[PDB]
Write a protein that binds this ligand. Structure first.
Ligand SMILES: Nc1nc2c(ncn2[C@@H]2O[C@H](COP(=O)(O)OP(=O)(O)O)[C@@H](O)[C@H]2O)c(=O)[nH]1
Ligand SMILES: [K+]
Lengths: 393, 305
């Protein structure tokens, strides 16, 4: 899960992390007034979308850039009016990026040195890790490629927690000289602890900087939250608005359906995660255009089936559905019913292809065969794949 | 130390198994069936019912007791997410040679702490969390997989997806090849057993003549594995290995049904995984539907049929 920047910032603030003063607003005028209340040398306008690279993106309104520096509050409002409502397309969003409904108006600061610092559960040390680079402002992947030695890591023992030894040593590595050096250290200890507190899989600050005034500041942040931790981060998950989600998916989650909309015509719902990915795969390989990926989670239930069939069809971009389910726990029969029972109550008008296998095979093939419905039966996933494709030519 | 516990991954007819969260909806359901398959389920657990009975079986208070009273060499966990973590350490404390956590949804941080405890000991070997479990066609079944589709045989299977394993199991029985041991390592980013823990076993198990590896986007478990194969499965007496990685078409930054299936910050993509495994002489199927025939051909190319 991901929260907006102003949400992340408050959280980091509430936990002793030096962020920049800011106010949130959802209109061009609030933005203006917000620039006034701040009252500072320079202001910073930042569209609030979960994506990154905003400061290099482009709004649909024609505006270029998601982060704008200006000393004049009236400009803040003029720029805002170009952010509020439009679509921002950063190098990390789709083609039409995301629609912005809120903007952050914060106090700019001067940046002497820019450094990249981040904490994450590393799938190599199977533990928390500190990842710093004295070269900030840039996308990390890059710096890595371009100059590996410029990267510094430090495995933190999840039971001992971070140690000055580590913190200070990282601070040194980041470039923070003498006096400042210990400030960056304290801050890094802050991030780690905040990181653990909020069950975050990662907290990324870029730049983790230094001002001329000699202040260590997290000028930007990106926190990814471990979804499996919602049950003990109730307050943090309440802030997840679910506004930037593709219209559809929201619906699916209402019936606990793992939906992930792609850009295709051949919708398809499968049970089990891997088969879900596998089906998109085998579809694309055969010139297909997976319209999505759906996962009926653990077990199924005529409810889900129908529901799953309703979301998929409500989408006018679909020209076929590829059902691929492996009857393990719940036999294929109970699945077949949910399918046929839905085709009728849904009066679907898209060529449907179904591929069943496992417990109760033969029986469920009759449940379908019988219904007299236009259900195309495939022999395996290859079969289902290729056929599901022609059905949209 | 912990690598010494790989040995425990090979359950068999001798494996006596207990269930944690025994009287729960899941524990109960998969236990009635764990029986019907032929698994030696000797009892289960739940706080405050020590002495009682469930499914005609005993219900102890502690994993500790249950083991010392049934001699169970294994334990399975179906418990809800907020308690699966505790459930594992409890098995670890009671030193149960084998622990299989099925539960999906355990906070990652919790798993990191478990891995910490875990790696500094060799009595307990963990499978999971968020996995189907493990099965020795005919002799033992710990988990939630459809036992009947399996048939004792030669192919050794290790995978990060359950449904994708079933696909594989189905395919190697159609071709009449059968499975030696199937280990579903999980869909989470931090678990107690990886591809190499199993490749290690397969390679030294005479019963396993071939191996099917099933991975997907996310992490680098597939990569470390491809490395290992190059080092340990090269030579004349090398066993054939067929694989299929899932997610060649997944959009970045998205969690694909599996907390661990996600390409992030440039890492996790499927193509590297296929390029790496191939470098280690792994024969990769480009279709999840060709797992069966592919490995069938490999055994063929070596008159191993
Ligand atoms: N001078 C100055 N620049 C800033 C400030 N805040 C952000 N920026 C710059 O705005 C640029 C784009 O915002 P960014 O942090 O990249 O968010 P992103 O584009 O979504 O990744 C960054 O490269 C920063 O250097 C600030 O307070 N003062
Ligand atoms: K940034």
């Amino acid at each position: 899960m991901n929260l907006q920047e102003y949400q992340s910032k408050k959280l980091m603030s509430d936990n002793g992390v030096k962020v920049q003063r800011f106010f949130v607003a959802d209109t061009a005028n609030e933005a203006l007034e917000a620039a006034k209340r701040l009252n500072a040398k320079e202001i910073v306008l930042k569209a609030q979308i979960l994506a990154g690279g905003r400061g290099k993106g482009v709004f649909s309104s024609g505006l270029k850039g998601g982060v704008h520096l200006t000393k004049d509050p009236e400009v803040v409002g003029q720029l805002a009016k170009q952010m509020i409502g439009y679509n921002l397309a950063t190098k990390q969003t789709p083609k039409e990026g995301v629609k912005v409904n809120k903007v952050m108006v914060a106090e700019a600061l001067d940046i002497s040195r820019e450094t990249y610092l981040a904490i994450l559960m590393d799938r190599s040390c199977n533990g928390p890790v500190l990842v710093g680079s004295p070269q900030g402002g840039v996308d990390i992947e890059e710096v890595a490629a371009s100059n590996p030695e410029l990267i510094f890591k430090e495995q933190i023992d999840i039971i001992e927690g971070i140690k000055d030894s580590q913190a200070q040593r990282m601070a040194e590595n980041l470039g923070f000289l003498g006096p400042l050096q210990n400030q960056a250290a304290d801050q890094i200890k802050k991030l780690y602890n905040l990181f653990l507190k909020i069950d975050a899989t990662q907290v990324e600050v870029n730049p983790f900087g230094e001002t001329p005034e000699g202040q260590v500041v997290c000028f930007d942040a990106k926190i990814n939250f471990d979804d499996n931790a919602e049950f003990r981060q109730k307050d943090i998950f309440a802030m997840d608005d679910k506004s930037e989600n593709e219209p559809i998916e929201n619906e699916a989650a209402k019936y606990d359906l793992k939906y992930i909309g792609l850009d295709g015509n051949i919708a398809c719902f499968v049970n089990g995660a891997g088969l879900a990915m596998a089906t998109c795969d085998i579809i694309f390989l055969n010139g297909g255009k997976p319209a999505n990926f759906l996962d009926l989670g653990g077990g199924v239930k005529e409810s889900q089936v129908y529901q799953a069939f309703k979301l998929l069809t409500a989408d006018p971009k679909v020209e076929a559905i590829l059902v691929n389910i492996f009857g393990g726990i719940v036999n294929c029969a109970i699945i077949a019913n949910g399918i046929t029972k839905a085709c009728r109550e849904l009066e679907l008008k898209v060529p449907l292809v179904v591929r069943l296998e496992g417990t109760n095979v033969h029986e469920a093939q009759n449940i379908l065969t019988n219904s007299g419905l236009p259900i195309t039966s495939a022999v395996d996933l290859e079969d289902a794949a290729k056929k599901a494709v022609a059905s949209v030519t | 130390s912990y690598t010494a516990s790989r040995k425990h991954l090979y359950v068999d007819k001798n494996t006596k198994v207990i269930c944690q969260g025994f009287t729960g909806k899941q524990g109960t359901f998969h236990s009635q069936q764990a029986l019907e398959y032929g698994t030696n389920l000797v009892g289960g657990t739940t706080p405050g019912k020590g002495g009682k009975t469930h499914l005609g079986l005993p219900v102890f208070n502690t994993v500790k007791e249950a083991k010392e009273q049934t001699g169970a060499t294994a334990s399975v966990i179906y418990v809800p997410p907020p308690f699966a973590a505790a459930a594992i350490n409890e098995a670890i404390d009671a030193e149960v040679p084998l622990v299989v956590c099925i539960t999906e949804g355990i906070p990652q941080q919790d798993m990191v702490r478990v891995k910490h405890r875990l790696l500094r000991q060799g009595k307990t070997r963990l499978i999971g969390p968020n996995c189907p479990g493990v099965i020795n066609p005919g002799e033992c079944k710990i988990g939630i997989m459809p036992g009947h589709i399996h048939k004792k045989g030669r192919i050794g299977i290790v995978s990060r997806s359950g449904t994708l394993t079933y696909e594989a199991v189905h395919q190697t029985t159609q071709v009449g090849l059968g499975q030696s041991l199937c280990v579903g390592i999980g869909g989470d980013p931090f678990n107690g057993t990886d591809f190499t823990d199993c490749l290690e076993i397969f390679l030294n198990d005479p019963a396993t003549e071939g191996i099917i590896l099933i991975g997907e986007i996310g992490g680098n478990a597939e990569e470390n594995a491809a490395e290992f194969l190059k080092q340990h499965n090269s030579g004349p007496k090398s066993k054939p290995v067929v694989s299929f990685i899932a997610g060649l078409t997944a959009p970045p930054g998205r969690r694909m049904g599996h907390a661990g299936a996600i390409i992030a910050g440039g890492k996790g993509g499927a193509k590297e995984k296929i390029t790496a495994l191939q470098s280690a002489g792994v024969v990769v199927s480009m279709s999840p539907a060709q797992l069966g025939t592919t490995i069938y051909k490999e055994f063929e190319k070596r008159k191993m049929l």
